[PDB]
């Protein structure tokens with residue numbers, strides 16, 4: 563149970579984005595139905611009044627929280643991966659539009675899931691803004707909590723992989739468009755009952771065997787991190 567509070571751009575806090583530049587849902591409950599319209603941008607997908615200006619190459623940091631800013635972030639039980647996707651904003655997230663910019667699942671070196679490291683990072687994970695066409699985008703940050711993912715939601719709706727989905731409105735101003743954004747995957751649709759990484763038993767199956775759901779990270783993606791960029795406590 564987690565939400566996005568706001569974003570940072572090059573280590574500068576853009577301030578509370580909830581219902582302002584984040585298409586915030588009404589609460590921190592997960593989406594679980596893989597065929598739900600709610601898979602796009604969570605349960606209250608609509609245009610919000612602001613879009614954060616960035617340039618290609620900026621560090622864009624998402625900041626998550628549980629109940630209040632810079633708290634426990636997400637229950638430690640919620641082990642799983644983190645991904646970020648991008649789509650042109652005129653799509654409203656519909657159709658074959660979502661392109662993956664970032665994946666982090668289980669780090670064998672550190673013996674930790676992405677969610678475990680997100681807690682340590684005070685809820686912060688970042689991407690480099692890609693060199694796509696200037697204009698308005700949706701950045702879809704997705705945490706998958708796997709603590710009940712041994713079941714398919716379609717078999718037992720009390721369980722299943724849990725999707726914490728947050729769409730941020732981002733405007734890319736300066737970009738040379740050296741990597742034009744291709745068509746991508748649909749949400750809902752890209753994840754199905756048979757997709758690798760959706761049904762996974764963290765109690766019996768080693769995390770060293772986990773394969774995160776496709777699609778693969780786009781060749782145009784410039785990278786990212788799970789690390790505290792900004793200190794919310796200094797404000």
Ligand SMILES: OC[C@H]1O[C@@H](O[C@H]2[C@H](O)[C@@H](O)[C@H](O[C@H]3[C@H](O)[C@@H](O)[C@H](O)O[C@@H]3CO)O[C@@H]2CO)[C@H](O)[C@@H](O)[C@@H]1O
Pocket residue numbers: 563590628629636637638639640709
């Ligand atoms: O026992 C089932 C699993 O519970 C997980 O805890 C979650 C609770 O089930 C859930 O009711 C609670 O929801 C809170 C939410 O955290 C809070 O932010 C909001 O204000 O109110 C909700 C209640 O209406 O969330 C917790 C997760 O934080 C355990 O984490 C898990 O191990 C356990 O299997």
Ligand SMILES: [Cl-]
Pocket residue numbers: 563
């Ligand atoms: Cl939960």
Ligand SMILES: [Cu+2]
Pocket residue numbers: 563564637640
């Ligand atoms: Cu939860």
